[PDB]
Structures are given as structure tokens and as C-alpha cells.
Paper text:
His257 is not directly involved in metal coordination but plays a role in the tRNase Z activity of PNGM-1. As His257 is distant from the MBSs and not involved in metal binding, the Zn1 and Zn2 in the H257A variant are occupied by metal ions. In the structures of all PNGM-1 variants, except in that of H96A, the electron density corresponding to the catalytic water remains despite the complete or partial loss of a zinc ion.
PNGM-1 is derived from a metagenomic library from deep-sea sediments that predate the antibiotic era. The wild-type of PNGM-1 has two MBSs in its substrate-binding pocket, and each is occupied by a zinc ion.
Numbering used by the authors:
A (entry chain C): 15 to 232, 257 to 373
B (entry chain A), D (entry chain B): 15 to 358
C (entry chain D): 15 to 41, 43 to 232, 257 to 334, 345 to 373
The structure:
């Protein structure tokens, strides 16, 4: 294998997993470091997004994956740094050839309006102008989002079970009731997406023997992160959710290494993990900054001509005549 | 003046404007081009954001301008590529030490549920879990968004007038009723933020003599085909009917006669920029910038200069203060004992 | 094909040429290394044409094993066209190149103005590197074998191996000695103009090139457009200008007054795939954090060796783990 | 103080030094890391280059220092990764408007053909064609290089002394006889540039109490095994015998007790830095930088500060027309009528 990972370029083994950090940073996205996002690709052809915070969509688009393959989204919690770029995935996939609705698994809160189902319904209402104007010229079928809201308090319970893939959830201690951690279990592998938490009694039990154990680390201190991973004994630990600059990262590393000796990644954007029977391998992805979307399906639409136009004649009557300025390139192009 | 703009390094004069392109790209995300965003700094100390598209918050933070100086946001329209980072300016700016509500100017639509007020209302309901948890430990008042929703059909009417600065709005032709252009007037200067439109009769008249005139300039149909794999049909219709083509922008800017025109809202790539430039140059001879992320204009009586910003990968960092940020004690914990009895 | 080229990720077909711009600039800056080109042919042959100051960092990010890039053609002896020869010589021979380098370069009007003089004194310049390295490593890969050809010769063959011809012809640039190259193989013709003011040779000997490279700024944009209209290439490439959001736009305008044909404004890591049916332009996306990929009397006096600091205490703990 | 260093933005104090890492890497080329190169700026206006490795000319250029202010160049040793870019400083510098010869200080070897004097003499012969054609249109005086070859064996002896600035040299153990470390002394400050060495008894004694102490720090035997597939045999050897290991570095800096230590000469990557850092910290507890390209140190009475430089992708002007650059008319053309007759 190449010492760096070029997205689009490597076949996945049937008993292989590929996990890509598409965001690793603090609440704000910064230029070096988008907010929390993960892409899981399974050797069976299944692909999931675990969190999709502010700024992460530029990193996801650089994987060259057709939108119709990235329709299942898991949210750890409803911080803007964990789902702020769902709207970019929603609208941009519905302009880049996604033909299915998006599917989102997210936790409930202590009440209706503290839950993922409420949050997504109001986000779609937020962008009603976008939805209603676009749906005049393009079948809206993909503009939907189907929310699978699970119980936040459930202790390591299944929330997903399709095609030999299980996601399970357990609670986190973070800001307010609702956040959770996920175990992804497939073909004898376990991948643990920590989300955000203060040190709790659930993660060390339910994460145990994970091939890849992701956990927040600054909330959870670097000495705790070390205590937690000592207990879990994962094949590989990943620390994330801190700034990657030349004056904390190194003492974070030290602080972990006080109680945890096992294989350890200090996650940065576009860091990549290959899980096979023999190894857990860490590389960097080298991906286009000047990204475009790549076709996959691009599988017709067939728009309804019954829907009312969102224009009035008052607006349409402002059209400028540009027939002259466009004539030459027009002619030449229609040839 | 240095040939590059280092944010926080240059004092802005009394008769001077600085504009930075914090986003210039598309609804398609890309590390090289955030979606549409413009920061304007005036010599009287007033600062404004016009559009705040998905990803732009990375470039806004690179400017070394504290969050409490960036509370006034103007939106041209309600596409994700123009207001998708509002949520991140809201939540991020709040933890970073803004002490006042966010002020958002935005158009109406043809009915309530097509307007900026409904849009911002539902966005705050969307992030209720975020807001209600934050409001436990920080003053909730910076958490508010005050919307100033103005009539989209209005022809060059003032929507804002305070401390010698005026914003005017006029309509655009884009996807449906609601979208607008802005002209910022201050101290003899006019700055025009075109937003998104097909070629229209209002922009050329109301933009006339602007020191800086920004307008959508589309990728050629060839470049649409080259990538989106289109037929010589829906690639063609885009440049004829729905967007402003490079030739259409040329014609509009010939009419405006600005000191300096800015083309934006295209992928600025090694194999796109040159045929877009030539499209404009067919019908417009005058001073032109092919925008990209972190291009900055300095506006003075003598000159409109174009430079690149050489900016840090800077985040705001949490503003834990005394201040106007003291929490309303009477708010309930958002924890139950079930969660809190889980600490290791 | 993928819309960006990822080096080491694409098999070259038997009737395909790949051409990568490893340097496009002036005398050496961060966006933009000095002139260099890598040509990969579908018969398995690889060449470097120019290796200017800074280019090696781009050549190393291609993930090409060192023993595959041992043939170098120099247009001329400006530092912006062979400054990183030494960095190929030393770093190739660290990276485990087992063969010496072969350098084709032109003569001058006299001995001390040609390539053989230049490379001989280059290796004498780095004698201390050479002589200390040769204590531990076999020095056979340290050699540079120079093929010096007549700078005067009008489109004469300088190289002829495995179905690949290089031809040289003269340039007009600083002084006698600079040349242009045509690479021919399997019906294809790739022209490396090097540096020059407009000359009568290039328009004649570049004619019908699959890819024609020419300096463009010495040669005006307008002049470049005049030349390429006469050359009528499948695809033209302008290079050796600064590519900041300013003068490139007018450079592009200048060319289009006289040349309408396919045209690339070369930047670092720009690559062209040449097939029967197309000449395609993509950008190469490659690692900034590159590594090598595999594919005598002592020079110490005892006075020096006597200065060794004992570091046993300090190195014991890591040592008792690593030995395990 | 801005949290990043913008070059050209910050007046240097009369009691202040700025040091910039213009290359931190290895003999394998890499866009992320040019070969060994250091720029040092004193508050008295004097500036020095210590090492000018292959590829470092890009980073020096980004500092917005004109070429006539960078004529003084000190080499630790004659490896490509410490003087490869001399020729680019030589020819680049001259065209750009250096008025005086290059001044180079470097060590002798055990014989003439192992010294800096021989190396530089043959470098100029190598680029005879460049020199002779340039010498037609510019005054040749800038194209000279005055070499100051000092005894490599001398123990902490002065090799340079002027304007209150002193450089001393002492030997290293690296490849064979000839390599050295420098100490720069000015205004009660000491900056040590270690060059390349295996652990030696001289550096600790002569570097003692440096304000900034730079020393080579090797990747782990672990890391050499992963990348280069070296056997446990030859891997352990590099970090035990020929190189300064991360642990060895920590032993030397614990002895030296600098105000601030700098590790360099290693690939600074997301899977190498952390285990290097950990090796130093086995034996050294004091202030430490793990060097990468465009890191900068400010030395004042109160602090040694580490920041990153946020610099533009700058190339030097290109001098044009001056009086000290006017061409020597006695010089012969290098064109023959055969080449001139080819003009179109
Ligand atoms: Zn959170
Ligand atoms: Zn978070
Ligand atoms: Zn729009
Ligand atoms: Zn838009
Ligand atoms: Zn030249
Ligand atoms: Zn060395
Ligand atoms: Zn070295």
C-alpha cells in the first residue's frame, strides 16, 4: 500500500474497514481543522457518516464518493460542531445526484424539543425557501430526511441492524442529557465513536476490545483519556477534539502515555485508519483542495409540472436583454 | 503598503474601506473556496458581514477580528451557500464573548414561510438542544437573533441607516421571489454586494459608479459539461437563462462603470479562470478582479487596490469572563440524575 | 479517470505518455519551483528534462523509485534549469539508486561553457560529501556520465534507445549553448522549448507536436501566440512566468490574439496525459510530507573521534525495549 | 505581540534577536521541509544565514528581506542539505540586486579538497556558463564569493568579529573531519547552531547557557524501521553510533541548560513528532521547540518566544538598473553571429 491514502484509489478488502477523520477540531471550524466528522467504509460496500459538524463537508467532498453512497448519517449529539454541515450534505447532495432521502439516527432528549427528531424537522423548516424554490424545477424526493430517533438513556442497545452491521449507543456526560457514543460492529470488527463526554462508567465497559476506540481529549483530560484506554485495551486509540498546534498536542500525548501504552493516534483532519485482521494502520489522506462532485447513479428525476411557480411577474419583468453578449459563445457551443 | 494583507497588521484610515472575500465558491464544498461571505471594514470602525455561506467561518476567524465587532450580518437570500455558517457565528460567537444579540438583515419572501424571519426563527428551534444547554452556564442574551426583515420588492430603499452608513436593497431574479442585492454607502463610497441573480435591469441602474461592484459570474457551459457531464442542453440553459454568464457580467459592468468590478461564485481553478476572464473581457474593459478566498480590496479616494490576505489558521477560543455573560441562575439544569450518576 | 492525478496510482497504457510540470517559475519560490519536467512513456522509460532549484521536492512527491529516474536532459546551464542536479545526485544515492546518473546537456562556444565542464566541477564542488559517503557506501551510484551534444545542431538526434529519440535545436538566451528538445516515440512528439527569444528553428522543428512547451513572459505572450499558430500543436503549454492573480490573465489574453488551439498555463504539479484520442490536462495531488520509496581510508582523525560523549545511561531504557 | 509572525511587520528592538527556521528537514526532498537553513536578525540591524540547504531559498524569500541584507552566510559542513541552495543565493541574489560579493564562512577539512575554499571555487566553475552570460549585462562584482575558511579543529575560537557580533566554531563528529557548530554572541545573548553531529564533549561545554540552543535530533530507530524497512541491526546503530538520538539530545540539553532548546533535522509528521518529543523528555525537562519550517524565536531580556511565521509565497524583485550593477564594458559577448542570425 502507498504511504499516503488517495481517496478513490484503493479497493476495500471484504474483511477490511477504512475510517477517515473529516473533522477533529473545537466548536468553531478553523482553516486547518473542521468540526467533528467521520467517514466509515466497510468491505461489504456500506458507508456511514458519524457526525458532520461545521466545515467538514469540504473534507467529505474530497473523498470523491458519489452522494447516493453517503445517505446514512449518525449524530452523537446536537452541538453545531457535530451536525452544523447536515444542511450542506442535504442541499449539495440534492444538487450532486443523490436520488434517495437522507437517513439520520440521532438521540432523543429529556423532552421532545431536546431531541434529534425536533432538531431536523425545524432545520428543514429553516431552509423552506431553498426547498420550495428548488422543488419547482426538480422532483423533491431527495430533499427529505428520514429521522430514526433512538433512546439516549439506553445502555449499549442496538439502534441499527442491516446487512451484518450493528450500531449500538450508550450515554455521554456532556452539557445536558442527550449525547451518546456508538459502537459499530461488523464481521468481527468493533469501531467506537466516542462523541463528547466527561469520563463515565459506560464507555470503559462497552468500548472494550474495540479495533479502533475514538474518544474526546482536551470534558475528558489527557490523564483520564489514558486511564479510560488502559481499561478498554483497544487495538488502537484515537484522541480528538483539541487544537493541533505546536504547544499542547505534545503534553496531551505525554498525559495519555502516563496510563496508556498501546497504539495511539493524535487525530487531525484527513487522518485515515485501515482495520484488517493483521493490523490497524494510520496514514494521512492526500485529497483535492479544488474538489468537484463525482457522478455515481445520476439517475433521472421527472419533476411535477402541477407545482406553483415561486416567481411573480413583478420579478420576472426585471429580466435584462443579454441576447447580443451571449450570441457568439452560444452558436459555437451548439456544435 | 505591503504587497500582501496580514490581518490585524494594518490600521484602516478615516477615508478608507477594506473588503475581504471570506467565500466566493458554490453550493459544492471545497477547501479552496468556502461558500459566499464578505467582510467590510469602514474607517469609522463599523464592520459588517454580507452573506455567511457554509465553510466561510474558517476565513472570518482568520481575520483576527473579535466576535463582538462582527454582530451585524446582511443576507442577500436563503440558499445554504449564503447563510449556512450563520449557526456557527451564532453558537461560536456566543462562547467567544459577544455580549449583544446577533443582528440579521434579510429579505421577506412572497409569504411568511419564504422570509428571513421564519428562516432564522426555525434555525434557532433546530439548535434548541445547543441553545438550552449553553444558556445553563452563559447569559442567554447574546444567544438571541434580532431579525430586521425588509420587503424584497423595494426598489433601492434604505433598510439600514446609522452612524453615517446606509444599506439599500433591490431585487434579484434567482430561483424564486425573495433574493436581493445591497449597496453600502458611507463617506462618498458605494460598495455593491450583488448576491445571486440572472441579468436584471435594477443592478445596472442602482450599482452605477460603485467604487467596488460585486456580481455573480458563472462557469462556462463547457466547464459545466467538462465536470457535471451535461448535454449541450442543460449546460447551455444555465448560462442563457438561470445565471449571469461571463459575457452577461461583462455587459452589466459596462453599464455600471464601477471603479472596480469583482466576478465571484465560480470555482477558480487552473483550467476554469482563463475562459471566464475572456468571457467578461468580451464586453467590459475596466478594472476587474476574478475573486477567490481571502482576496482583499482597499478603497481610498485615489485607488481601489487588490491584494491576497496572508492569514493565520486562527480560531476564536472560549471567552470565559465576568461581564454581560453572567448566567441567568433561575434556568433549570439540563441534566437528570441518571446521567450525572454515570461519572467514572 | 479521476479528475485529479494521484502519483503512483495510475497504470500507463502501452500507447500513452504522462508529462508532469515539477517546476514552472523564475530563478525559486514557495508556490512555484524552477523549471523541471518528468516524462513517463507507456514502454516503461522515464526521463527528467530540467531539474531547477527547488524541483526535487516536487519530483520526490511522485513516488517514483530512484533507479527509474537516472536519465536527465538539460536545456541549458542556468541554476533555474539544473540547480537540483546535486539534490538528485546525493539524495538518489541515499534513496538507494544503484546506477550512476546519465546527463545529456549541450556544449558551449568553448569547453568551460558546456555541460561536461559544468558537471565535472559540480562533482568536485561536493568532494567532501563524495569522499566521506564512499567510506561506508559503495560509490558506483555517485558517478555522473555526461553525453555532451552540439548546441549548434539543427534538429539532430542526441538520444536513440528502445524506440525513443531526443532531437535538440538551438535557442537564443543569454549566450551560445541553450537548446530545445523534441522527444519522439510511438507516433507521439513532445517538445521541451527550454528558454528562448523568438527563433526560426522552434516553429519549424516543433511542428505537429502532441504537446509543445515554450517560454512565455525572451518570448512575449503575443510572440508565443504567433509561434504556436504556426506550430499547430494538439496542445500548447506556456511556462516560465509568475502565476499570481494578476499578469497571467493578460498573458492568456496576449496568446489568444494569434493562438486559438488547446492551451495550458503551466503551474507546479500540472500533468498531461497524451493518448491517440486526447491530450488531457489535470493537476497532480501529492504528499507535502514525502518520503523515499524503494523499488577507502577513513576520513576521521582520532582527535575528532576522541570527542565522543558517552550516552549509555540516557540510551539504556529505549535500547532494552528495541532489542526486545 | 501578534500570536503569529508576519514577515516585514515587526520592528526589531535594540535588545532583541529574531531567529527563523528556513529549513528543518533532511537530504530527502519534501515540500513540507527544506534542508537545514536559519535566518538570524539582530536589533543592531545585522543579519546572518547559518546553513542554506537545498530548497531553503523559498522560505528565505518569504521573509521580505532584500538580498543586499543577506550577504553573510556561515556553513556548518559541506552536505547538500546544508549548502545546496548557496548557488541560488549566489545567482538569485545577484540578479535581484546584491551590490557586493557573497561572503561565506565555512570549515577546512583534513586537506584542501575537503574544505569550504575548494568546494566554493568548484561550485563557481560548475556554473561558469551562468556567471559568464550574466557577467555580460550586470557588473561582475556581486557574482564573486569571498570565502573565509577557518580551521575546523579549533576549540570555540573566534572565526568572525565585527559590530559587537562574534561567531565561534567547535568541531562535530559527522561523516568525517570538517563539520562544526557555531555560537553567535551579541549584546549578552548566545545563539548556538549545532549543525550535524553524534554526541560530543564540546557542544555541552561551549553551548552552556545559550539563549537558543539548536541541536540535531534523530527520528526513532522504530521510525527508520517503519519507513526505510531497516533491520533492528542497522536501525539501533543510527540512534546509538552515527546520529544524536532523541534521548541523546535530551542528555546534551540537560547539560547545556539553555533558556530554550530546539530539536531539528527530522521529518516533522503526524506519526513521528510525538515519539521524538517523548525521547527528549526522558532526560530534558526545560523549554523545548520541535522545529518545523517557518518557526520563529524572539529572544528578549524577559522571554524566548516560539511562534509560526505566516509568510507570502514571495520571490525577490529582480534589480533592473543601478550604478554599482552597471556592466563592465571590456567584457566579450557570449553570443556568436550563428545564434543571433536565428532571430524571428
Ligand atoms: Zn459537544
Ligand atoms: Zn464537540
Ligand atoms: Zn443562490
Ligand atoms: Zn449562491
Ligand atoms: Zn535560462
Ligand atoms: Zn550532514
Ligand atoms: Zn544535515
Amino acid at each position: 500500500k502507498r504511504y499516503v491514502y488517495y481517496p478513490g484509489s484503493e479497493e476495500l478488502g471484504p474483511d477490511e474497514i477504512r475510517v477517515i477523520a473529516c473533522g477533529t477540531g473545537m466548536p468553531t471550524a478553523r482553516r486547518a481543522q473542521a468540526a467533528a466528522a467521520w467517514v466509515v467504509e466497510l468491505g461489504n460496500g456500506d458507508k456511514f457518516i458519524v457526525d458532520i459538524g461545521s466545515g467538514s463537508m469540504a473534507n467529505i467532498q474530497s473523498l470523491m464518493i458519489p452522494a447516493n453512497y453517503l445517505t446514512k448519517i449518525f449524530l452523537t449529539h446536537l452541538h453545531t460542531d457535530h451536525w452544523g454541515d447536515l444542511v450542506s450534505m442535504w442541499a449539495g447532495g440534492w444538487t450532486a445526484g443523490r436520488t434517495d432521502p437522507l437517513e439520520v439516527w440521532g438521540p432523543s432528549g429529556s423532552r421532545e424539543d431536546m431531541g434529534t427528531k425536533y432538531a431536523v424537522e425545524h432545520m428543514l423548516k429553516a431552509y423552506n425557501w431553498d426547498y420550495m424554490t428548488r422543488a419547482v424545477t426538480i422532483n423533491p424526493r431527495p430533499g427529505d430526511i428520514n429521522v430514526h430517533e433512538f433512546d439516549y438513556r439506553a445502555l449499549n442497545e442496538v439502534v441499527y441492524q442491516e446487512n451484518g452491521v450493528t450500531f449500538r449507543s450508550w450515554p455521554c456526560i456532556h452539557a445536558g442529557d442527550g449525547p451518546v457514543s456508538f459502537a459499530l460492529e461488523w464481521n468481527g470488527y468493533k469501531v467506537v465513536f466516542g462523541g463528547d463526554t466527561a469520563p463515565n462508567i459506560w464507555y470503559p465497559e462497552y468500548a472494550k476490545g474495540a479495533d479502533l476506540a475514538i474518544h474526546e481529549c482536551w470534558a475528558t483530560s489527557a490523564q483520564s483519556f489514558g486511564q479510560i484506554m488502559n481499561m478498554v485495551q483497544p487495538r488502537h486509540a484515537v484522541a480528538y477534539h483539541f487544537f493541533n498546534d505546536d504547544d499542547t498536542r505534545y503534553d496531551i500525548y505525554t498525559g495519555v502515555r502516563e496510563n496508556y501504552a498501546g497504539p495511539l493516534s493524535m487525530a487531525t483532519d484527513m487522518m485515515v485508519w485501515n482495520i484488517t485482521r493483521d493490523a490497524v494502520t494510520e496514514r494521512m489522506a492526500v485529497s483535492p483542495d479544488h474538489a468537484w462532485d463525482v457522478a455515481g447513479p445520476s439517475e433521472d428525476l421527472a419533476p411535477d409540472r402541477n407545482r406553483a411557480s415561486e416567481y411573480t411577474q413583478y420579478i420576472l419583468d426585471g429580466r435584462l436583454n443579454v441576447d447580443e453578449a451571449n450570441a457568439h459563445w452560444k452558436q459555437e457551443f451548439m456544435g
